[PDB]
């Protein structure tokens, strides 16, 4: 399901980045195993205060019936929830109901992320919620 | 179209822009309101530092979006 070369790479890049490398590795690997349309890569994330930070991100298309997304896993995961943006890469900007769910900061306002409990939630659940996002009206 | 630009000092800025406006044009508008030279400006949105040559539309920045500004001396 997940090439061993990817598993080894995943374990490798996670160690120097995450406070909780065991949970980050378990949850991210489980996610890749469950959703073959998703892939991992690390990229430098630029925070609002200008600080750059290399983080693991998972990207690809998720089904809603589909939307391209980039999910970021914060270094404090799971104490802090992941965050997701629509992946505009390569799209002909001349295009979404999903837009009504995107907050002013450009993140998808997934309910579960605002009602986050670091002891009973994982990345797989996050993607599951994304798949049903349109079933409820945009909160705030 | 209205968008906001938040600064490190908690200060917020309001700008009138078009989706086709380039990042460079947006920096020019910021200079007009705050007197800050474009060269000192770094605009950030959703984890990315924005590129002068691209447009707001290119980053899917919609009305009411909040961009962050940080200044740097080159």
UniProtKB/Swiss-Prot annotation, chain A:
Any one of the GO CC terms: ESCRT I complex
Annotated ranges, domain UEV: 5-140
DNA-binding listed as a keyword: no
Domain of life: Eukaryota
Keyword Hydrolase: no
Assigned keywords, A-Z: Coiled coil, Cytoplasm, Endosome, Membrane, Protein transport, Transport
GO BP term (any one): negative regulation of protein polyubiquitination
MF terms (GO), sorted A to Z: ubiquitin binding
Compartment(s) where it occurs, according to its Swiss-Prot or TrEMBL record: Cytoplasm; Endosome; Late endosome membrane
Function: Component of the ESCRT-I complex, a regulator of vesicular trafficking process. Binds to ubiquitinated cargo proteins and is required for the sorting of endocytic ubiquitinated cargos into multivesicular bodies (MVBs). Mediates the association to the ESCRT-0 complex. Required for vacuolar targeting of temperature-sensitive plasma membrane proteins STE2 and CAN1.
Additional information: Present with 1360 molecules/cell in log phase SD medium.
Quaternary structure annotation from Swiss-Prot or TrEMBL: Component of the ESCRT-I complex (endosomal sorting complex required for transport I) which consists of STP22, VPS28, SRN2 and MVB12 in a 1:1:1:1 stoichiometry. Interacts with HSE1 and VPS27. Interacts with MVB12 and SRN2.
Family, per entry: Belongs to the ubiquitin-conjugating enzyme family. UEV subfamily.
Domain notes: The UEV domain is required for the interaction of the complex with ubiquitin.
Protein name per the record: Suppressor protein STP22 of temperature-sensitive alpha-factor receptor and arginine permease
Organism: Saccharomyces cerevisiae (strain ATCC 204508 / S288c) (Baker's yeast)
Curated annotation (Swiss-Prot), chain B:
Crosslink (Glycyl lysine isopeptide (Lys-Gly) (interchain with G-Cter in ubiquitin)) position: 6, 11, 27, 29, 33, 48, 63
Modification type Phosphoserine: residues: 65
Ranges where the Ubiquitin-like domain occurs: 1-74
Residues under site feature: Essential for function: 68
Role according to the record: Exists either covalently attached to another protein, or free (unanchored). When covalently bound, it is conjugated to target proteins via an isopeptide bond either as a monomer (monoubiquitin), a polymer linked via different Lys residues of the ubiquitin (polyubiquitin chains) or a linear polymer linked via the initiator Met of the ubiquitin (linear polyubiquitin chains).
Protein encoded by which gene: UBA52
Compartments where located: Cytoplasm; Nucleus
Name of the protein in its database record: Ubiquitin
Membrane-traversing stretches: none
PTMs per UniProt: Phosphorylated at Ser-65 by PINK1 during mitophagy. Phosphorylated ubiquitin specifically binds and activates parkin (PRKN), triggering mitophagy. Phosphorylation does not affect E1-mediated E2 charging of ubiquitin but affects discharging of E2 enzymes to form polyubiquitin chains. It also affects deubiquitination by deubiquitinase enzymes such as USP30.
Coiled coil: none
Annotated site, Interacts with activating enzyme, chain positions: 54, 72
């Amino acid at each position: 399901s997940v090439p061993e070369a990817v598993v080894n790479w995943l374990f490798k890049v996670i160690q120097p980045i995450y406070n909780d490398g065991r949970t980050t590795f378990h949850d991210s690997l489980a996610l890749l195993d469950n959703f073959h349309s998703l892939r991992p890569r690390t990229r430098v994330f630029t925070h609002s205060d200008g600080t750059p930070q290399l983080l693991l991100s998972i990207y690809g298309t998720i089904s809603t019936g589909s939307i391209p997304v980039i999910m970021w896993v914060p270094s404090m995961y799971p104490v802090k929830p992941p965050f997701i943006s629509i992946n505009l890469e390569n799209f002909d900007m001349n295009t979404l109901p999903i837009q009504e769910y995107i907050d002013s900061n450009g993140w998808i306002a997934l309910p579960i992320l605002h009602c986050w409990d670091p002891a009973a939630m994982n990345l797989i659940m996050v993607v599951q919620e994304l798949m049903s996002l349109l079933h409820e009206p945009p909160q705030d | 179209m209205q968008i906001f630009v938040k600064t490190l000092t908690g200060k917020t800025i309001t700008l009138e822009v078009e989706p086709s406006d380039t990042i460079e044009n947006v920096k020019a508008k910021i200079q007009d309101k705050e007197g800050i030279p474009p060269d000192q400006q770094r605009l950030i949105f959703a984890g990315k530092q924005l590129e002068d040559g691209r447009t707001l539309s290119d980053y899917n920045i919609q009305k009411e979006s909040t961009l962050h500004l940080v200044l740097r001396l080159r």
